Amino acid sequence: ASKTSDVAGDGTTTATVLAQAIFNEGLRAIASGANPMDIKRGIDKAVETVVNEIKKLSIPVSGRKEIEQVATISAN
Amino acid sequence: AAKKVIYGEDARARLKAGVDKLANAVKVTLGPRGREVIIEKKWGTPVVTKDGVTVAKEIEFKDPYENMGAQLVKEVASKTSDVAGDGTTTATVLAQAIFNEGLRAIASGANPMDIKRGIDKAVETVVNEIKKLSIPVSGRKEIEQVATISANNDATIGKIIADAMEAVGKDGVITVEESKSAETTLETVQGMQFDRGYLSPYFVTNPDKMEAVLEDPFILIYEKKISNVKDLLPVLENVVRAGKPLLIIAEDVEAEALATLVVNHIKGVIRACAVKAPGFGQRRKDYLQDIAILTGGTAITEELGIKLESVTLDMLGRADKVIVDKDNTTIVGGKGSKEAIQARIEQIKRQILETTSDYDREKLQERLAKLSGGVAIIRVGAATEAELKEKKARVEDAVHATKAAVEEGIVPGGGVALVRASEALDNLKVDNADQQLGIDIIKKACRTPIRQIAANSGFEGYVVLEKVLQLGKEKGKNWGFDAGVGDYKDMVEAGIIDPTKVVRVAIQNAASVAGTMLTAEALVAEIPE
Amino acid sequence: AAKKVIYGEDARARLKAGVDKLANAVKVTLGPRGREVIIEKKWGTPVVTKDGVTVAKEIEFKDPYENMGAQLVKEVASKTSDVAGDGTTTATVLAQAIFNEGLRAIASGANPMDIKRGIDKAVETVVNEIKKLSIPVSGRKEIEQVATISANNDATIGKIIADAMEAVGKDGVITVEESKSAETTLETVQGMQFDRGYLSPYFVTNPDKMEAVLEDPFILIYEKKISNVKDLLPVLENVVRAGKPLLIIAEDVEAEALATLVVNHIKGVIRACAVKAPGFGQRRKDYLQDIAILTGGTAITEELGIKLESVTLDMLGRADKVIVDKDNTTIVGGKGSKEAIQARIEQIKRQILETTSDYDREKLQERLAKLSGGVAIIRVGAATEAELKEKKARVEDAVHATKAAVEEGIVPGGGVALVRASEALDNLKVDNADQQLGIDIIKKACRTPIRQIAANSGFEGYVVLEKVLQLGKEKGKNWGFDAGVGDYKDMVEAGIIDPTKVVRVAIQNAASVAGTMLTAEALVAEIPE
Ligand SMILES: Nc1ncnc2c1ncn2[C@@H]1O[C@H](COP(=O)(O)OP(=O)(O)NP(=O)(O)O)[C@@H](O)[C@H]1O
Ligand SMILES: Nc1ncnc2c1ncn2[C@@H]1O[C@H](COP(=O)(O)OP(=O)(O)NP(=O)(O)O)[C@@H](O)[C@H]1O
Ligand SMILES: [K+]
Ligand SMILES: [K+]
Ligand SMILES: [Mg+2]
Ligand SMILES: [Mg+2]
Ligand SMILES: [Mg+2]
């Protein structure tokens, strides 16, 4: 949560929710006998793919319409 | 009374502690070189055992909830011996392994219901692999080996059982007796054993199994249904006056008054028995009249002129011992002259060629074997009552286990069978992740008994297990670890083999109780004091 | 004795803890795949059950105030089974849901009296929807399905009940018996059923459900009022000498002395019972004389010249068993010759034409139906006597539950019926805010049993509930979740159906006890020394 706030200023609750999900599912895999170091290597590969996919969905801000929409959503 | 209820994870925590305390005491005695367990005997010297069954008999805990787990595993493990004659300690070891690993998976968030489905599927695959691996018993060589291994690796009982088995036949009848003589011997006393039930459950004499056993009894045999009680009272009273028991052989008895009155009048004293007829048809008389003349008695009916008003204690059939089961009856010995009895056997010898019914020809040549070969009575002998008691149940379990080997086959012992069977789980696959966990639980459990045997002997369990797995491909499926001497060899050739029913029942029984306790949600017990 | 009183919120806090401890132990066994509950049996192996009724019977707490809540819910839940056969666990689950949510609303400041008014109003709407959703039973298909679900999903018991139902008719009388045989069979005995009960309350015997049972009784038939006991004594003393109980069928007994001398004079012996003469009008004798000859006897009257001081026991009627309810009486079957009895049926068959009045002609061809169809005796067998007690209770309840289905209809099982009924509460509206809270309490409660069934089988309760709500309009009202196999299907076609009496009574009973405890203001109990 601290790093997310420093870098982006928003999404700290989403980052915390994501972190718990990765850790909880990782423990289940490790309890089945998986190698902890290989799981981390697999996680790193998946995040690289996921970040690439997100940039594909990214649409540049055209003007005031998206600026108002982003501000409204982030302000609850 | 007031009761305390424990729910959820706390309930299974109580069970795990109770099962562990039971298993940790018993598993140290597994194998041929099990460690010693010392049991207190009040006002006596402590007893040192490596038996496992003896250890499990004394185990009982103060905590009612921990006692719940111990008794549940004890009963299920005891049922393994009641069906197969062996495997009580192995079933307990397997039960702890499945339960402990099952709780670990649930603690990680796995679905308990899906784990049981994986366990059920894995057990089915393991049982099928055991069926493929087992080989039928061929002769005296394997029967002696099974009896020796079923006992505590004592070849004396193994030889006696093998001799007794080959005497009465591969599927005959064996019984165990005792004497004050230090030596033990096998006597082929003539008798028979057929699947006949008894007329009323009220003939219980001594066994808690609601069965009946008789010593030096007098046999009444009838070709038709039981007559009135007043016709039997001159026999019921005078023979009791004479100080000997009685039993009545007849087709049927009325349960309204005849069944109740006969036992009620004799309930306060030695009591008597009554049994049914074998098979069906008029050829019952072929068995009935022979047993009447082979035991020195007569078959009584008013159509033969034997009036019930003038019954005399001398028409009774006489034999050495009679044992009545729930569905079977066996009679040992006979007080008549053996030459005339064997002369009356010639009728059965001629009945081989003269009878025209297949249903009796199927039981023919068995009416001879139990008589001509004699019902095998093992006369166990020991120098002390304590040793006599120990060896007495020791022989019957070995006899029962040997019969189980004939019925279903033999498999390499020392836990090799479960190791080989667990290799099939390496390729069994399911679409559910939690069910896969259940499969891996059984694979780990199947490889525990071999590790415990190696550990008890003084070797590292995982090192032994790895080499046994390697020898499965390098040498063969039957190669394993000989804990008696400490080297790897072919277990079947060495004679270290187990009945395949023992391995099959133990894993099935252990998985059933473990699965039951894995989904237990509440424990209800009274508050102490 | 000195007593301690608890007032206000503290009193309801005690009740909530007691109800929760009862419900949490029982609700885990709800559904076809309920979890295991392990019950201590002192000097025995612990008992493992998924029954719920068995668990509830054993629950009792040390704290007198927490025990108050457990016993109150237990009695109300037990009355559901006593009236509709099934539903004991469901009523307990509903009671906890209503009580817990009711306490939450009160803790927020809502008026408890207005909450109760909302609860009663909401229950009435739910009950009406249940009746609207039910469909009448049409034939053997639904009868067999209901009996199977009422039992532990065992088709063997369902088939026997279905066969017994069609043999005797849907309005006959059925009873459960046992024998030594392990297998279970159906016996159609030459019996009959009537609609008049006992004459005195002291005749009620031992059984917990207060249904008096008599074994091997003799029958006396009177055409008028009973005479003095001095005439009865020669019969009574001789019948006592015969060693069997005696039954008197007559019109009335004088209450001044006879109503006490009839019972008091025999309280120290085998005892006897008397039953009202059934029927009306002159056909009473036809109801008596025909039945007397069906039971192998004829009527007796002092004024007819047959003095009771001279009657003979062979002249009296005899039957296998006689069963009498508070408002009804039945005879299992006469001990006379069946051929003559079936010949005597013509005398009742001729009553279709040889009798004029139509008042009992409605009961005619039903007395024939009670004769031609007999009375069904379910001979239950089990591997052991302890298991016989378990099986006998379930079969009797399944018969009772099946009869409830005929009376009122059937609804889709698995809690779907309550889910469908709860949807009407979405449009029910009231002008009081607190009464609206009571309505929403019932809506939440009605959707709890389906979630518990899904949770026990290993699925998320709210996910299952949400999809069942969706399938209510995508597919139909009868669509629900099958817990035996985890997929959604039409419940009525699948045979997963419940008697609509069970669902109706359970919600009505649960709301009554919950409403009682919501406004309880004081608890009075003795100080435990
Ligand atoms: N020489 C041996 N080397 C290796 N394993 C052996 C040897 N002799 C016996 N075994 C195995 O050890 C086990 C028997 O030990 P035992 O302590 O009798 O176990 P159990 O039969 O489960 N318990 P019980 O009911 O008391 O006989 C079996 O798996 C045998 O196959
Ligand atoms: N295969 C099934 N799938 C879904 N629900 C089922 C199934 N079989 C039965 N049910 C439902 O489960 C409930 C029966 O479970 P049970 O444990 O007998 O509850 P009860 O009848 O309230 N308790 P008891 O009095 O002990 O029988 C009913 O609501 C049935 O409709
Ligand atoms: K041992
Ligand atoms: K159940
Ligand atoms: Mg934000
Ligand atoms: Mg052994
Ligand atoms: Mg039920």
TrEMBL record, chains B, C:
Top-rank lineage group of the source organism: Bacteria
Q: Name one GO molecular function term.
A: unfolded protein binding
Annotated PROSITE patterns: CHAPERONINS_CPN60
Q: Which residues bind ATP?
A: 29-32, 50, 86-90, 414, 498
Keywords, A to Z, come to: ATP-binding, Chaperone, Cytoplasm, Isomerase, Metal-binding, Nucleotide-binding
Task: Give its E.C. classification number.
Answer: 5.6.1.7
- What NCBIfam families does UniProt report for this protein, alphabetically? GroEL, PRK00013.1, PRK12849.1, PRK12850.1, PRK12851.1
- How is this protein named in the record? Chaperonin GroEL
User: Which taxonomic lineage is given here?
Assistant: Bacteria, Pseudomonadati, Aquificota, Aquificia, Aquificales
As recorded in Swiss-Prot or TrEMBL, the protein's gene is named groL
